[PDB]
Amino acid sequence: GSHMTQDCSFQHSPISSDFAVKIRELSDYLDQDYPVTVASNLQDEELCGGLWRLVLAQRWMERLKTVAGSKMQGLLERVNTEIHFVTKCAFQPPPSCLRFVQTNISRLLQETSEQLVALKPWITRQNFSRCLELQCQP
Amino acid sequence: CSFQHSPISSDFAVKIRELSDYLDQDYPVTVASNLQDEELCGGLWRLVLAQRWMERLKTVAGSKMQGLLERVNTEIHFVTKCAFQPPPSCLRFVQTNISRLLQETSEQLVALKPWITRQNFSRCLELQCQP
């Protein structure tokens, strides 16, 4: 269920063993290299920073479902399912300090896979309420 | 980087407004956060960046938007005729919506329109950041 009023923590792992294969499959079969963004000045925390990058990536995945054709929906949703859990927490709006770089979906997917590798052993073990506010580097 | 005939038509603002108002689907875009505050070179720098977004949006917008997008592209495509250089590493960006990008674009064209056929703009080919 949702975690919108309570602590941002997970009793069952939302990240499956085969996230890397799912992400590599979408990246290999994409029909075009859609223009997206990544944050450029997030505070360099491994765990919170992974969640922050997944919050942003998850929004891109939903956006792409609205512009990619039929044939991409299953591949896109497979990646969405590995990262959709962040929507269950009350992440707050990004701060005005946040900066971005425009890049391509392939780079975003690579970054996403890297965050899941970092988060997977931790995801069900921690209270991540401390991460709901995105932070920038000075 | 100079123009013998004005590449900006009288009705740019109506064309941009039409795209903004009837945009069928929003898609995040970027604008620069720390460009040097030059009115004329700065307008050109913002249009170089906006014109690349117009081309990107054609690759994600549906059939019905292509005419609206191209009508704006034609108003700002003249920047592709100059040898603008790759942005410097200092340049940073914010994520925003197409409406904001379009309002910024219209504002640059109002500033540039009286100057565009008179001036040599070679001094603008390198984008500059604020201190």
Author numbering:
A (entry chain B): -3 to 134
B (entry chain A): 4 to 134
Can I see the authors' text?
As part of efforts to better understand the intricacies of FLT3 activation, we sought to engineer a monomeric FL. It was found that a Leu27Asp substitution at the dimer interface of the cytokine led to a stable monomeric cytokine (FLL27D) without abrogation of receptor binding. By mutating Leu27 to an aspartate, we hypothesized that the entropic penalty for burying a charged residue in the hydrophobic interior of the second protomer would be detrimental for any dimerization event to occur. We concluded that these experimentally determined values are in excellent agreement with their theoretical molecular weights and confirmed that FLL27D is indeed a monomeric species in solution. With only an excess of FLL27D detected, this shift indicates that despite its monomeric nature, FLL27D was still able to recruit all available receptor molecules into complex formation. The molecular species has a molecular mass of 70 kDa as determined by SEC-MALLS, which is well below that of an FL-mediated receptor complex (152 kDa) and therefore allowed us to infer that the apparent FLL27D–FLT3 complex consists of one molecule of FLL27D and one molecule of FLT3. Given the observation that FLL27D still binds FLT3, it comes as no surprise that the absence of structural deviation from FLWT remains valid for residues 6–13, which are all key players in the largest interaction site of the FL–FLT3 epitope. Importantly, although the triclinic unit cell contains two copies of FLL27D with apparent twofold rotational symmetry, the observed apparent symmetry axis is dramatically distinct in direction and context from the twofold-symmetry axis in dimeric FLWT. Likewise, no combination of symmetry relations can reconstitute the head-to-head dimer resembling FLWT, despite the fact that the loop containing Asp27 is located near tightly packed crystal lattice contacts.
FLT3 is a transmembrane receptor that is expressed on the surface of early hematopoietic progenitor cells and dendritic cells. Mature wild-type FL belongs to the structural family of short-chain four-helical bundle cytokines and consequently exhibits a noncovalently linked homodimeric structure, in which the two protomers interact head to head. Due to their highly similar build and the dimeric nature of their cognate cytokine ligands, RTK-IIIs are thought to be activated by similar mechanisms. The binding of a dimeric cytokine to an RTK-III induces receptor dimerization that results in transactivation of the auto-inhibited tyrosine kinase domains and the activation of downstream signaling pathways. However, structural studies have shown that the hematopoietic receptor FLT3, a class III RTK, does not appear to engage in such receptor–receptor contacts, despite its efficient dimerization by dimeric FLT3 ligand (FL).
